[PDB]
């Protein structure tokens, strides 16, 4: 199935997670653990922002313009992106805002890191309707030496009911 | 022992909790449940802001100026406030910012509601040093129909170790 994974500051603000306060090592470990050996779908700015494929995974880039790197697979539509992942238990949509908004209707699971911090940005995570989603897990953590804000991991699952 | 109870927006901002977004009914129930039948200590603006004693409890007001209501006990110092509570298992310090900063060194427990919201304010909860405190409980909750932001209850306890 299709899952969205994102780190959200207050007001559901997202930004390219090489800036701060998205340099939270705990979120980085959570991200790695939850995307390990799964194909990942991303947009072209996100691809530009990481500079090299995530290792040991099919990396798919969803963009209207022709590809410029043969270490990844380039596609033009959501359905081509999904077909490019093949028959796998879980596809991880990893950014950015426009890619999140195109895959939200097909997604069944959300892996959200709620970060207790304020950042300027126009880019918000899509507005998941509380009624369509059930929170199945959360785990709060204080700020510590490695992590400069408090943060909370959350997993939600789309309701049939 | 002495406990501080407070609702904190992002950046540890606090404000008189009759304004929003401190009108979160879930926080109100958490507050009630954790202060029921315990004496409460508050500052004069907090006392002004509630307009009437919290029922079924000794209400103590810590202020430098003479009292103006005989339904509560007025004191001038921290030690008079604590002595006025008598021999009880738990004293609840309920606001405001200056009262929190005077009782923090004697406190052994903190009941914090972390609210996922931004509010203007100069008044911050004191800067509890992460090393002196252990988080013993947390519980995250999504925004829903009654509660307009996501929030997390937390309890911390002062370390001897
Ligand atoms: C790790 C940050 C993150 N957290 C959560 N919860 N969800 C996400 N979707 C992203 C993300 C992201 C993008 C792909 C991104 C990743 C990285 C990144 C940083 C370090 C590693 C690593 N080598 O482990 C991988 C990717 C860098 C820039 C960007 C724009
Ligand atoms: C309920 C808000 C709150 N939450 C948390 N976690 N900690 C606190 N210390 C306060 C507080 C407070 C102060 C005393 C306050 C309480 C109230 C209030 C509102 C409703 C009731 C009630 N009748 O249950 C009681 C107090 C109103 C204004 C203000 C300045």
């Amino acid at each position: 199935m299709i899952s969205l994974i994102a780190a959200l500051a207050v007001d559901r603000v997202i930004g390219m997670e090489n800036a701060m306060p998205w340099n939270l090592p705990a979120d980085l470990a959570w991200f790695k653990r939850n995307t390990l050996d799964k194909p990942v779908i991303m947009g072209r700015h996100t691809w530009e922002s990481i500079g090299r494929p995530l290792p040991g995974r099919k990396n798919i880039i969803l963009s209207s313009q022709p590809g410029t790197d043969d270490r990844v697979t380039w596609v033009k539509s959501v359905d081509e992106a999904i077909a490019a992942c093949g028959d796998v238990p879980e596809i991880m949509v990893i950014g950015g805002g426009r890619v999140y908004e195109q895959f939200l209707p097909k997604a069944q699971k959300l892996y959200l890191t709620h970060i207790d911090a304020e950042v300027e940005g126009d880019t918000h995570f899509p507005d998941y309707e509380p009624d369509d989603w059930e929170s199945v897990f959360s785990e709060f953590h204080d700020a510590d030496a490695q992590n400069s804000h408090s943060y909370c991991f959350e997993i939600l699952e789309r309701r049939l009911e």
Side-chain angles (χ1 to χ4, degrees), chain A:
Chain A
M1 29 70 53
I2 297 164
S3 300
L4 319 184
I5 182 156
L8 274 56
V10 73
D11 220 60
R12 300 206 179 167
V13 169
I14 57 182
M16 246 69 288
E17 293 109 326
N18 43 351
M20 304 168 308
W22 335 97
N23 305 322
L24 279 190
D27 177 73
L28 176 69
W30 160 265
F31 179 75
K32 288 180 61 155
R33 174 177 138 268
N34 285 287
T35 63
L36 191 72
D37 313 309
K38 299 175 194 180
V40 299
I41 299 173
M42 77 200 78
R44 191 175 44 88
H45 302 112
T46 300
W47 162 248
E48 281 153 6
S49 168
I50 64 185
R52 75 177 304 114
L54 300 190
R57 285 174 259 242
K58 191 147 181 210
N59 288 230
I60 293 144
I61 321 307
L62 169 70
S63 176
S64 68
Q65 305 299 132
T68 56
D69 191 308
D70 65 18
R71 298 168 299 170
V72 297
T73 299
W74 297 81
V75 297
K76 302 203 197 295
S77 77
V78 162
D79 289 345
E80 292 166 344
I82 291 170
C85 300
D87 190 352
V88 292
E90 192 173 13
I91 297 168
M92 300 307 291
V93 179
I94 74 176
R98 290 171 305 141
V99 173
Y100 296 135
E101 40 172 318
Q102 290 175 278
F103 284 87
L104 180 62
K106 292 155 186 279
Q108 321 269 60
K109 197 162 171 194
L110 306 180
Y111 298 79
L112 301 179
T113 304
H114 298 283
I115 296 160
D116 186 47
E118 236 281 6
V119 3
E120 198 272 341
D122 339 73
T123 322
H124 300 304
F125 187 78
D127 203 43
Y128 51 108
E129 206 197 65
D131 310 67
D132 289 318
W133 291 91
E134 196 188 344
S135 183
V136 297
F137 175 76
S138 58
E139 180 192 88
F140 177 88
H141 290 263
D142 297 321
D144 71 0
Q146 296 66 30
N147 296 280
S148 74
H149 294 273
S150 73
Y151 53 97
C152 191
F153 302 125
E154 190 181 15
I155 301 168
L156 303 94
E157 267 175 22
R158 198 177 274 285
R159 275 194 254 253
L160 13 151
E161 34 273 26

